[PDB]
């Protein structure tokens, strides 16, 4: 049972949800910025 307390999770599941949502928003905004500069040419 101690060896199955080892795994790798320690935060409350609310904190896991907060981390997952924040990281989802991060990947969204970074992909949106990179797509903006994919589409935008400052020159003609």
């Amino acid at each position: 049972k101690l060896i199955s307390t080892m795994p790798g999770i320690h935060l409350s599941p609310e904190q896991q949800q907060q981390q997952l949502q924040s990281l989802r928003e991060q990947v969204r905004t970074k992909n949106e910025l990179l797509q903006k500069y994919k589409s935008l040419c400052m020159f003609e």
Partner: protein
């Protein structure tokens, strides 16, 4: 010399516009990267 002056002015104007655009773009990238933190 007048004609060469206006020609130099035109090429400087195009370069200035392109520089201001790339400068503002780099500033926006820096703002996004600092806001993500």
């Amino acid at each position: 010399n007048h004609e060469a002056a206006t020609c130099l002015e035109d090429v400087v104007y195009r370069g200035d516009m392109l520089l201001e655009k790339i400068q503002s773009a780099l500033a926006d990238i820096a703002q996004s990267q600092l806001k993500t933190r």
